[PDB]
Scaffold this active site. Structure first.
Site, PDB file in Angstrom:
ATOM      1  N   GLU A  62     -53.521  11.409  68.855  1.00  0.00           N
ATOM      2  CA  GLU A  62     -52.657  12.132  67.940  1.00  0.00           C
ATOM      3  C   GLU A  62     -52.959  11.855  66.442  1.00  0.00           C
ATOM      4  O   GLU A  62     -53.272  10.703  66.017  1.00  0.00           O
ATOM      5  CB  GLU A  62     -51.208  11.689  68.254  1.00  0.00           C
ATOM      6  CG  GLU A  62     -50.062  12.258  67.445  1.00  0.00           C
ATOM      7  CD  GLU A  62     -48.724  11.580  67.756  1.00  0.00           C
ATOM      8  OE1 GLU A  62     -48.645  10.356  68.074  1.00  0.00           O
ATOM      9  OE2 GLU A  62     -47.694  12.305  67.723  1.00  0.00           O
ATOM     10  N   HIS A 105     -52.525  11.012  62.801  1.00  0.00           N
ATOM     11  CA  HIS A 105     -51.694  10.007  62.142  1.00  0.00           C
ATOM     12  C   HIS A 105     -51.912   9.999  60.613  1.00  0.00           C
ATOM     13  O   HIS A 105     -52.124   8.914  60.015  1.00  0.00           O
ATOM     14  CB  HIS A 105     -51.980   8.617  62.705  1.00  0.00           C
ATOM     15  CG  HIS A 105     -51.199   8.275  63.942  1.00  0.00           C
ATOM     16  ND1 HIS A 105     -51.456   8.853  65.174  1.00  0.00           N
ATOM     17  CD2 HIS A 105     -50.141   7.444  64.135  1.00  0.00           C
ATOM     18  CE1 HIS A 105     -50.613   8.357  66.071  1.00  0.00           C
ATOM     19  NE2 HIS A 105     -49.804   7.511  65.476  1.00  0.00           N
ATOM     20  N   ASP A 147     -51.824   5.118  68.777  1.00  0.00           N
ATOM     21  CA  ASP A 147     -50.825   4.946  69.825  1.00  0.00           C
ATOM     22  C   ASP A 147     -51.350   4.260  71.095  1.00  0.00           C
ATOM     23  O   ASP A 147     -50.567   3.753  71.842  1.00  0.00           O
ATOM     24  CB  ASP A 147     -50.194   6.293  70.182  1.00  0.00           C
ATOM     25  CG  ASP A 147     -49.218   6.750  69.128  1.00  0.00           C
ATOM     26  OD1 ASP A 147     -49.086   5.970  68.142  1.00  0.00           O
ATOM     27  OD2 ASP A 147     -48.547   7.824  69.181  1.00  0.00           O
ATOM     28  N   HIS A 195     -46.502   5.746  72.276  1.00  0.00           N
ATOM     29  CA  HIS A 195     -46.268   7.112  71.799  1.00  0.00           C
ATOM     30  C   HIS A 195     -44.871   7.531  72.222  1.00  0.00           C
ATOM     31  O   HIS A 195     -44.557   7.641  73.421  1.00  0.00           O
ATOM     32  CB  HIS A 195     -47.354   8.020  72.353  1.00  0.00           C
ATOM     33  CG  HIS A 195     -47.203   9.468  72.021  1.00  0.00           C
ATOM     34  ND1 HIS A 195     -47.268   9.966  70.743  1.00  0.00           N
ATOM     35  CD2 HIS A 195     -47.148  10.552  72.834  1.00  0.00           C
ATOM     36  CE1 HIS A 195     -47.182  11.275  70.769  1.00  0.00           C
ATOM     37  NE2 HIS A 195     -47.138  11.662  72.034  1.00  0.00           N
ATOM     38  N   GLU A 214     -43.080  10.204  72.425  1.00  0.00           N
ATOM     39  CA  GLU A 214     -42.952  11.357  73.298  1.00  0.00           C
ATOM     40  C   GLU A 214     -43.256  11.078  74.799  1.00  0.00           C
ATOM     41  O   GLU A 214     -42.795  11.833  75.696  1.00  0.00           O
ATOM     42  CB  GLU A 214     -43.843  12.472  72.769  1.00  0.00           C
ATOM     43  CG  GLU A 214     -43.322  13.090  71.470  1.00  0.00           C
ATOM     44  CD  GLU A 214     -43.841  12.408  70.202  1.00  0.00           C
ATOM     45  OE1 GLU A 214     -43.960  11.146  70.181  1.00  0.00           O
ATOM     46  OE2 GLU A 214     -44.111  13.160  69.221  1.00  0.00           O
ATOM     47  N   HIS A 257     -43.810   7.714  62.094  1.00  0.00           N
ATOM     48  CA  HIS A 257     -45.068   8.217  62.569  1.00  0.00           C
ATOM     49  C   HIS A 257     -46.069   8.178  61.412  1.00  0.00           C
ATOM     50  O   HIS A 257     -45.986   8.970  60.462  1.00  0.00           O
ATOM     51  CB  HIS A 257     -44.977   9.644  63.053  1.00  0.00           C
ATOM     52  CG  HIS A 257     -46.315  10.250  63.375  1.00  0.00           C
ATOM     53  ND1 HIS A 257     -47.100   9.808  64.415  1.00  0.00           N
ATOM     54  CD2 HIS A 257     -47.004  11.259  62.801  1.00  0.00           C
ATOM     55  CE1 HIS A 257     -48.230  10.499  64.441  1.00  0.00           C
ATOM     56  NE2 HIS A 257     -48.193  11.391  63.474  1.00  0.00           N
ATOM     57  N   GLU A 285     -46.535   1.360  61.687  1.00  0.00           N
ATOM     58  CA  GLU A 285     -47.826   1.459  62.365  1.00  0.00           C
ATOM     59  C   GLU A 285     -49.003   1.145  61.501  1.00  0.00           C
ATOM     60  O   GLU A 285     -49.984   0.598  61.990  1.00  0.00           O
ATOM     61  CB  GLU A 285     -48.063   2.857  62.926  1.00  0.00           C
ATOM     62  CG  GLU A 285     -47.218   3.224  64.123  1.00  0.00           C
ATOM     63  CD  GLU A 285     -47.556   4.608  64.639  1.00  0.00           C
ATOM     64  OE1 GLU A 285     -47.486   5.590  63.853  1.00  0.00           O
ATOM     65  OE2 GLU A 285     -47.903   4.721  65.841  1.00  0.00           O
TER      66      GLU A 285
HETATM   67 ZN   LIG Z   1     -47.162   9.052  68.579  1.00  0.00          ZN
HETATM   68 ZN   LIG Z   2     -48.237   6.636  66.331  1.00  0.00          ZN
END
Ligand SMILES: [Zn+2]
Ligand SMILES: [Zn+2]
Ligand SMILES: [Zn+2]
Ligand SMILES: [Zn+2]
Ligand SMILES: [Zn+2]
Ligand SMILES: [Zn+2]
Ligand SMILES: [Zn+2]
Ligand SMILES: [Zn+2]
Ligand SMILES: [Zn+2]
Ligand SMILES: [Zn+2]
Ligand SMILES: [Zn+2]
Ligand SMILES: [Zn+2]
EC number: 3.5.2.10
Lengths: 259, 259, 259, 259, 259, 259
Positions: free
Chosen positions: D33, D35, D44, D119, D121, D177, D182
């Site tokens: 994904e 970022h 992730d 992650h 989701e 996010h 992170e």
């Molecule tokens: Zn994510």
């Molecule tokens: Zn992430």
């Protein structure tokens, strides 16, 4: 309040009813489908729900929230799935829904289920759902779960009642979509949802010995019904209701004898 | 009778509504789940359906039959799926249900759908259902179908209202399962389905930063609730109702501007 | 050799027949199911395959390799799936098969398909296979694929023929499993596969207005049949065959007019 | 070489560890994904994999190869699945992967698994996979398989650490996010994959109490991030890393006590 | 009449054969695929069915109706699924079909199954079907079901026979699509279905060490074959037939020793 | 840093590479499988990942995170799925993972993908996934997606190289599981993960012309390998590496000529 609908009970009440032994659960299975110019579209859910409620009240059973969406409408039984308003599920979805509910009832401790279909086209997907769930139960060591499946209208067998209902000869359940049978039971249960004045009378639907796909709209009566409901009366609805409730109540007593 | 529920309309009335352009459909998505000793189990269906009805009345939209069964209850948001009564669907089933309904609505000519979730655990499955159906819709050449998804309680954002609702500080939506929020909204809409005298008060549920499967029954408060509902009042419910209806109604006006 | 079976033609021959325009394809759909003590188990495949061959020969159509395995046998129409020998597919597999075939025929350039069902229980799954395939075809831009589905016995409608066939009154297609109809048609096509001397005569099967699962073996006649076939004769088989082949041939001409 | 990664062991070494009793397996579950302009896309996966490695080193567990692809990115949690680079699986796919893995671990003899999500989701799909696998295990007579699922960031609960981490108040894991959390943890583990100079600072993402589909790109910060990571520092990463590793290690010791 | 085909027996006869102990069932698995300008398209079903019949006759086994439809033709082993006539199933469908049949055979009481594949591409899907079935069987407590899977052509191993068959060196089973092997075997069993005069001779098909999708039609010989069958003779077919029938018969003897 | 791994790039970098035209993506597809007493279990992922990396470096392509879990190990090619450590997916899971990743790449704008399988049993499931994805793409109006699938070991064709590699005659790729080929390539790439001293030498695995399920452990060599790797040398690994990297690189240039 002693409601027969599981959804209106607390979990503790339900638990108690199941633990008490031989609790019978009932699942109405219907549809959101067009029903002519004179009736609402939730008929196939309402009818079997009402029949369940009354049967449950007579035999002390519980009723699950009904399946609002059923299998695709078929021309020769429901007019067809090309009509607006009718909102159908795919086979796999219906089947899976039935399967998931049966597994969960098994988890609860229930072992007695009555599935009451109100939409013709659901049958076989309900049956697959049942087989698949039972198959799973056997894997889980559960072999004492029993299910009774029925379409409420099939309990109207007595020729005398049929004659009294259809003084003109009975055409058959096939074309009984939005016709006398349903409209009448509807007049006796939910009069506000039915307006006989919009009934577009027409001759009973007739079809060749085969089907055509894509569904040809011309082959269904414009109003969406398969037979006229002008002769529909609340009185007939009342007769049907009793016949159904009584017959189903007795069947359940036979298949699910109190322990 | 101008019902806002598609199921109570004839197919012709529905057809006219859609053909009129920019018709908005609303689908309540709930669950059959234990909600403690003081409430019934269809709460998650009844609440979003009631909110949808009032919003629909305010903005002239139509409401579909609500999804009665939802995804499996989780321990930290609904107590867990080990509880009797709660009857849950597998993720694929729920996703397929949403996907089938959206597909059918597109066939009808609808292009505007608001999904109103009343069960925390359904979210992602609803999302997948939407994604698969929109994907399919593109294959079919349809790019103008628009969906708005929401959990009605998210519209209770105003710190003043939150403060007034929870004069004790807000704990969070997580432990709002069978607590003040729902019991309150339930008191103002379906009083007969709620009995504050059975409320088993207890400290708000607390959990470690992780989850355990198989679900451990000891980590959920015995009553099944995740927070006490003794401070729940009908007045609170009335305030929540308006905040939600007004907020949702406005949001729909924003996303679905009349054409 | 001008065979009507696609399987016995070369791809060049087939390709030609399809490129020639308006080529009609026929798929027999049957089952491997017990048919009492007096007939073999592949009846449901043989019969519709035989009817297809003859129809095809008359109208110049092609016949596909028949589906040998069908949906689970049901008590009220095929005796039940608890019998040995009967080998059934799950509903998704049967639907999947039909869908896969239709998609490939479309790929070939075929746009005309007749599905001839020989096993009562297959219907709805065939129908789902058709809907799902046509839905996919639309995604592919193909809107001129037409399907005609039929169960060959439905073409025996003429009361004169029914009377001649059942001088005793017609009981119905439901209990026509391993009965007069099939055994007769079987005596006029595959006499070797039928031995009238083993026919365990019994009264026609009768059932309550509902179904029970797990299937109760006691509710099915021991032999597996739903009606006796002792009055079955080759002469009757010959009449049925002609009635079907002629009726279906004309139906196909109506639905699939040469271009 | 005592690697904690199952993939770097021979089957004999793994078999012995499992046979030794109470062997804990750890499966990292992440995603591919976008970022923001400042980090790589495998975050992730890397992050939970790094935390797993260090936990396993501390408690003597083993780590499985991580799931590289996760569920579709959602607007309010990861920017949306419209961004290039993010490569997402369908829900059934992710669920099936988790289900297949657990089934295999069970086969090995493992009965203790920690699922570490990186992650947001993925959660519910991981949950469904766990549920489906456990269900199956019961069919197989195995009732002692225990799973601990967690999203490593939920282990950062201490207000003191949160305060120290977010001297400006904590916004919430939703908009974290490509943010401070992170990016910081990424600066202390894989500095080469992060370049703070590309950080497109912007105000924290805000959204209405609902979602829209198809996803509206204008509702997501152009960079893809939901909060700025300019204040992200390696020192913060190191604090996060320890807080997580230690809290997780302890949790595992609680849930998986040595036998 | 002692037929070896289950479809031609009554259920009672089958039930006796199964109850007699160690009954071996054989399921031919083929395809409806183009086989060049010289042969019909059901070859892959016909050939394994013929072998099965003869083996069965020798060892006293029973043969099931063959799977008429197989997996998608692959370029390097069957020409490619872009050819007209070839009608293929999706992987899921074939696997499901095999899974369902096995499950049913187990229900019958059968515990010994020989799967005879006649279409190269079916293999792995047959394998997955077997694995999924057996997994299920374990859930059902059945651990004594044993399956032998084979492609009949693999029994032609003897270099002497290979030499005698291919006096020119063996090219391999890969390009043996519509070539010498099948055409010969075809000449000795179904001469009517083969016409050597249309054989479009061409050099053996060659391909790079990879595959391309979408399938490129130019990379497959225009006739549809992967090797010429002009040298195909009935004599060769007779040799192949005996070699296969005898070798398989013995293998079944080894794997399924009479009890 | 110019990494060839998509996962190490930012989305902006990836967006650019794709937008620049004809960008080739490579997906390594492997397994977590026992590889005897001398090697680790992630071999089938590592090897193809390594080869991709180097080919990508040479032709300027990008490499996706690899599929860490593959299809069930088969006795005749991987020893069997009864070994501990090996963790396999169901066919459908593998196939769907491939299908979802292709759909996403097409969304990204990619139209050129190379799948590099490192696990023998993955093939047909990768193929189905490609076919299913492509079918979907056509529905979406995309027809210019092209895929090249290959197993890297297939590029070792030169008899000279084979001779040099196997001075003892080549046995075949079937029994090349945990043998010379892989162990060698493993010695030149990840020496730490391989320990030649634990190599349990044994004669090449031999099997009858058929398969048996449930898998019989006695028919696979105890160590799990299908052929000894004592003659495995880093030198051989280097030769294989170049032969593969070069031949693949060339193949990609042929199939994906720069625009
Ligand atoms: Zn994510
Ligand atoms: Zn992430
Ligand atoms: Zn109705
Ligand atoms: Zn209906
Ligand atoms: Zn609730
Ligand atoms: Zn809930
Ligand atoms: Zn029959
Ligand atoms: Zn039948
Ligand atoms: Zn062939
Ligand atoms: Zn073939
Ligand atoms: Zn390997
Ligand atoms: Zn391998």
């Amino acid at each position: 309040s002693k409601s027969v609908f599981v959804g209106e009970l607390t979990w503790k009440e339900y638990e108690a009813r199941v633990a008490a032994g031989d609790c019978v659960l009932m699942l109405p299975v219907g549809a959101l489908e067009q029903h002519g110019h004179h009736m609402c579209m939730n008929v196939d859910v309402l009818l079997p729900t009402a029949v369940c409620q009354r049967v449950a009240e007579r035999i002390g059973a519980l009723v699950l929230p009904g399946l609002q969406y059923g299998y695709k409408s078929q021309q020769k039984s429901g007019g067809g799935n090309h009509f607006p308003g009718t909102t159908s599920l795919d086979g796999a979805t219906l089947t899976g829904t039935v399967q998931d509910i049966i597994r969960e009832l098994a988890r609860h401790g229930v072992r007695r289920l009555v599935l009451m279909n109100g939409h013709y086209e659901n049958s076989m997907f309900i049956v697959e759902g049942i087989d698949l769930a039972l198959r799973e139960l056997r894997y889980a060591g559960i072999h004492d779960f029993k299910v009774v499946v029925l379409s409420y209208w099939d309990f109207v067998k007595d020729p005398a009642v049929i004659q009294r209902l259809y003084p003109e000869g009975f055409l058959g359940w096939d074309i009984e979509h939005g016709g006398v049978f349903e409209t009448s039971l509807m007049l006796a249960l939910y009069p506000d949802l039915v307006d006989l004045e919009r009934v577009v009378d027409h001759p009973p639907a007739t079809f060749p010995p085969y089907d055509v796909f894509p569904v040809d709209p011309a082959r269904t009566p414009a109003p969406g019904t398969l037979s006229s409901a002008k002769t529909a009366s609340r009185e007939k609805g009342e007769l049907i209701l009793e016949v159904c409730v009584q017959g189903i109540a007795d069947a359940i007593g036979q298949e699910f004898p109190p322990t």
